[PDB]
Design a protein around this ligand. Structure first.
Ligand code: TD6
Ligand code: TD6
Ligand code: TD6
Ligand code: MN
Ligand code: MN
Ligand code: MN
Lengths: 556, 556, 556
């Protein structure tokens, strides 16, 4: 009975069990206590392995893979604060639905709370943020392999969304040659080793029922609000709202084509709010709405019913309207609730939206971040994807641009953390294999700076644009107090990113006008590598331009 | 009444109350929901304020500040994944005793679990890792200020060691001019506002009693094992063990002067373990023992009694010996259990330690990480301090060098994370104001790379040595399997740090020999700035040198 | 601004919201802090109010009501240990699926952890046993009513099974005349007050999909195992299994009619185990299987697939077979996977089941608890229901009796507690309004003795048989060691229950033979009251009779 070999057999059951649920990507950080998991994973031909040294970035890389591939993605981490570093991506996964399977190696129970090295209390350490939590017991052959596979199978089979914490204790010795210890224990699973299915299949589906009065409600004056959803869903929602004759308010994340662009501007005009007051129903598809004027309009509107359709559980209306919360795949839901062609009821809003867009176009020339947001459609890679950072860039793109229907957009908009954007973008790119444009601010680029290491391995060109406005200039847009603003809010770091790019041998451009930026992009798309494009802009020009456009459009 | 003004009144009671328990340093990350806290702290003249954009590094900076100053240190963070980024530093503080007061802003209860932006479930999210957890209620004048101050006074007054999680929800609006809202509510505390005492003084001391049979046990054949303690404590333990005539096995962190150096080597010799089989009592002062040979000996020794004296709570002997766990300040404990002058009882071990040290001396010439560790005592800044990173650097110094008694050594050996060493070193430096030598591995430097921003501001010279052996070479010291070792264990990142240093305008040196290294050091100690010294070494030389010195010393 | 009036309005929103999710029965215990809830409930005409002074019994009465009604049942309790007494029924509800809504009054946050009277920490006190937990905030007008109703609507709407803990803090004053305070706040909800729907409808349904290979599996050699389910599902499962030609092993709780009765005896016969080895699939419907021989058979059998179909979630196979865990209403599942008539495949089992029952019939004469169990069908009230206690009674009825198909049987077989059987039986009776036969052991009756107060109010005759064998004679059946058995296992209490019955003015009988038992029953059914029939039997005769019938049946 070799402890090291049985630790290995136990782990091989866990990992092989994961392969029966769609886990193909596994992200691994270095460690000693995780050896049984890591070796089980390395010897398993089902996995694509990714490696990173920073477990917070490691968690965000897994999140980007899961976000893009829609599979569960596994993560192996050693014991101690490495486990803690998984918290941010786990939090975000719990909010937006990515299936992250966290395999956290642990010390055995005899080494907890007694001053041993790198030993901490890990069961329950993520509180209520995992969808399921499994605390595996100390490995022993007195517990049959069928229990372990069944525990794993219950956890993955019943997972509608979000992360799973699987705490895996192992006693030393961890190293040593494999002998037959644990082989007959494994062989009790019979030909399951050669199968493609779970040992225990427990796969209940969670779905709201068809709404049987939809045919009554679809004849009313409605509004469609389109939040985060897949690209194909964005197209279906566009055609659906058009057939209904209802105005479609489309988020940067919808991929609807935003037929009423610049909603964050024209929702500031009283003609629009007044016309919107006639809506008897709002059907919102998807969630995590971006614009401030749209969030305020949602919070103040009083339709007879407010419906939110999404495949993520729980309340999604922060204004708590009377209405419905419908759990469904958005495309399936539209098939169950089809549109009948009806005469459009909005007259003032389309003209207002065209005028707002025309006001933004009048201001496209200055070499600023507001204009980059407005012109961003001109730089999207062909057959590619966009990853949009948090803070001002997602706001400016939402307010000032009209992104094309069905062009894929990704984001970390569950909790809107600025802590894992580059590594998430690296997962997005690796999962799809498509050329990727990722836009972030300077504080966001500094936060996840070491994720530049990951960006040295992309399967297609990735352009990382860093808008360097010297601090978090979102706090120049909000009414922060002037005396404390720079030190306690903006926090300018007075850096450039040329040396960061050279450190990881990434191409770098710092364009000074539109022609140089166009040159930078045309060069960058030429090879499967990451290019850093730094846009240096005056600190507050973007926030001020957005405010001025808000006032201008509110007086139309 | 004005909600924004009352929010800042509530927060001002919180912050001012912290000043009554020794809180001097406040570390602040940027955010909007944190406005009541941040402005309350910014207006309070009692505080020194530190800022940073990454909350993980922000927490470790507070950890270094508390580590040196031995005072509670406060942290202000906004809602969301920013709070989760504090987990590693909080875990380490829960293990080594630093008192971190985490003030985490939150959305109001009506905005949890409903799709609001940057809103997550925050009460309890650090599980059992905080020493105290307080979930403040939604601010209201119906709860009197005396309750609020009493709650904080209870948490800080009864805080023996570890972190305090204080979750502070605030409702909008957050911005707006201060009016008289909440003024009379505040004035119900009377002249407490001008006092230096807590509103409620609750400060019970936790201490083991004098051991009344100490006069019996100090005459037996004893061994002193010295772990982490303060520099003063290290010298007092050295004199105490010498007076007892007991061998002193001194850790790199003990500051005892290590009168029997290279214990990680000579404890591998059968003559030493055989002599140590005669010990009737082991008195260990401090914890987090570093060396492998010392851990194995502690694990195998069978004295009649094993005592651990430390000012942190809980079990600290991972081999679970029969004996005593004594909670005390080590200097106080030595005073209560004084030595008596007795004849030394070990004869073979001193001869053995001299031989091991000479075997190390014979190999001092090669320009390697083993040799840098052995020679580090020749490079300590006068009246300075040493910060030792984790992985090989602390083990090689521990095994191969003899650090001078009473020279302050700092580290993160609670959980031995490699995730916050640079920001912790910045805090260590800022708290003491002393010149600082910090030594870390390359992966450790990559993990906390953006902490170089913090190192742009030190009050005295800081030398950061980055030992670049291209990966985590601890996994060349351990018997990791050869085929998986590089991809899944070592993870070489093939980088240098000249561009990192250049990005943050730090002086940089890449010495190629001893003479260039001493030139680098002589230059660096001249100004109050950080100098980055990259020592490029061959990947596996350090690990092999250590293994050969172990074998050689085993055969003496 | 009246605090007592607003407390009442907040509570009235909670209680009215509960009426929209089917809550009709509400169980109330006395208290002062619960006043806002209790008075809101007393004013609401939608409710049937039940009262009891023991909150443990109060929790089990609610469990019995919910068990019968198939509707969420509310409970109101005051602050302190009253809340803790709810734990047993809450745990059982989490195992068998009853929806108990626990409204636990609490002190406000300013009175927790400060030495106030009857104030304890109540959020989270039921750990993971509730399906949902809500910690309501301190009541205030600044949190809108639509939030409070939405929070409850989410909790009740997404509740598939089990209890909900809603902690309701209230500040003083609690008493005082209703003025206008909070009226306009309530009025925000508009005509929701005159509506019969939730404010927010969130009712996603969890169900496994059709098994698309069922047409293959239903023509194999299968076994049907019938656990706990409804009376109607019992009849449909019987007809289904008969049509398939599969042997039906039916539990006491199945109401299948047990066409192969005395399985706890004939599964001890080697011919049966050998014949059932031929089974290629087991489909189990329901769970909480009773018989020891059936649990051992399940644990040892090795069909190709093992399926458990039930309306509750989670793993239900304690032997962790390879197979399927199918979440469904059992009747819906049967219509989705219909039987086609095929010839029976078992040859030995029908004769052996007939023989086993005939061996029981041979021993029916003695006036013992085994024979009472075997003859219990002779005493079932027409158009009534049976409540079976735990320990020996349920096993003896399972092993020795053949209960009619579709005759309702109720029990507390989730955790098999003996702590709330009389108050559960009282709830079963009150919710259905039907005449009831409840059978319990003496220690179970002592445990819940004050529940006789509840049994003074039944809407139809309830007969309570107490089998008094002087202690827990289950431990004479189990191989407990003889020397410790009486003091530490059996614990005879040497009591009778005539004075118990007299205390609560219930008719009482102690029959000495079958004619006297018949006479006692004939008297008891004449009025809508509770009758106590104590059957005094020799301590170990039941266990001995069961053992001997097992041996006899194994030698067939
Ligand atoms: C991990 C963490 N910790 C702190 C924060 C707080 N926080 C923000 C949220 O407030 C805004 C998101 C949102 O609400 O949707 S934005 C922001 C500044 C970003 O600076 P930048 O990259 O330079 O971009 P810029 O502002 O355009 O100039 C910070 C520091 C956070 N989000 N995440
Ligand atoms: C946050 C976190 N996550 C992962 C680990 C696992 N872990 C280690 C534990 O074995 C620590 C040992 C020790 O006890 O000191 S060491 C180690 C390698 C460090 O590489 P380096 O800096 O380049 O230095 P070198 O090895 O000397 O070459 C890692 C990656 C961790 N400790 N903390
Ligand atoms: C609250 C709690 N605490 C303790 C127990 C343990 N426990 C039992 C479980 O082992 C068995 C339940 C079952 O499986 O059905 S049975 C049992 C004896 C009951 O005595 P009885 O009424 O006199 O009946 P008789 O045994 O037939 O003579 C006890 C004391 C419990 N169940 N619940
Ligand atoms: Mn910025
Ligand atoms: Mn290294
Ligand atoms: Mn009994």
């Amino acid at each position: 009975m070799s402890v090291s070999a049985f630790n290995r057999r136990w782990a091989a059951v866990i990992l092989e069990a994961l392969t029966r649920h769609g886990v193909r990507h596994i992200c691994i950080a270095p460690g000693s206590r995780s050896t049984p998991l890591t070796l089980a994973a390395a010897e398993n031909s089902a996995f694509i392995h990714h490696t990173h040294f920073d477990e917070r970035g490691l968690g965000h890389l897994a999140l980007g893979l899961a976000k893009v591939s829609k599979q569960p993605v596994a993560v192996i981490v050693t014991s101690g604060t490495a486990v803690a570093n998984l918290y941010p991506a786990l939090i975000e996964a719990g909010l937006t639905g990515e299936k992250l399977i966290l395999l956290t190696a642990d010390r055995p129970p005899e080494l907890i709370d007694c001053g041993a090295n790198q030993a901490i209390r890990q069961p329950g350490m993520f509180a209520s943020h995992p969808t399921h939590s499994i605390s595996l017991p100390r490995p022993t052959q007195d517990i049959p392999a069928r229990w372990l596979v069944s525990t794993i199978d219950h956890a993955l089979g019943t997972l509608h969304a979000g992360g799973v914490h699987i705490n895996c204790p192992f006693a030393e010795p961890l190293y040593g040659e494999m002998d037959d210890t644990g082989l007959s224990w494994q062989q009790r699973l019979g030909d399951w080793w050669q199968d493609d299915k779970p040992w225990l299949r427990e796969a209940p589906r969670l779905e709201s029922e068809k709404q049987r009065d939809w045919f009554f409600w679809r004849q009313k004056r409605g509004v469609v609000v389109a939040g985060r959803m897949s690209a194909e869903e964005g197209k279906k929602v566009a055609l659906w709202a058009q057939t209904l004759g209802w105005p479609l308010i489309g988020d940067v994340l919808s991929q609807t084509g935003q037929p009423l662009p610049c909603a964050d501007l024209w929702l500031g005009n009283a003609k629009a709010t007044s016309e919107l007051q006639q809506a008897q129903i709002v059907v919102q598809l998807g969630s995590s709405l971006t614009g401030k004027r749209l969030l305020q309009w949602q919070a103040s509107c009083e339709p007879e019913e407010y419906w939110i359709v999404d495949d993520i559980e729980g309340r999604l209306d922060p204004a708590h309207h009377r209405g419905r919360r419908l759990i469904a795949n958005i495309a399936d839901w539209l098939e169950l609730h089809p549109a009948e062609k009806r005469q459009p009821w909005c007259v003032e809003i389309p003209r207002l939206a065209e005028q707002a867009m025309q006001a933004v176009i009048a201001r496209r020339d200055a070499f600023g971040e507001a204009q980059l947001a407005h012109r961003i459609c001109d730089y999207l890679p062909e057959q590619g994807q966009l990853f949009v950072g948090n803070s001002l860039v997602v706001r400016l793109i939402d307010a000032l641009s009209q992104l094309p229907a069905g062009y894929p957009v990704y984001s970390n908009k569950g909790a809107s953390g600025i802590d894992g954007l580059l590594s998430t973008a690296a997962g997005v790119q690796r999962a799809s294999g498509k050329p990727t444009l990722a836009i972030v601010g300077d504080l966001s680029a500094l936060y996840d700076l070491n994720a530049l290491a990951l960006l040295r391995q992309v399967s297609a060109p990735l352009v990382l644009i860093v808008v360097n406005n010297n601090g978090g200039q979102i706090f120049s847009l909000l009414p922060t107090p002037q005396s404390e603003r720079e030190r306690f809010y903006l926090m300018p770091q007075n850096v450039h990113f040329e040396h960061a790019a050279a450190m990881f041998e990434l191409k770098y451009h710092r364009p000074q006008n539109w022609q140089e930026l166009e040159t930078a992009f045309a060069d960058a798309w030429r090879t499967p590598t990451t290019t850093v494009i730094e846009m240096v802009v005056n600190d507050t020009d973007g926030a001020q331009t957005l405010q001025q456009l808000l006032a201008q459009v509110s007086h139309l």
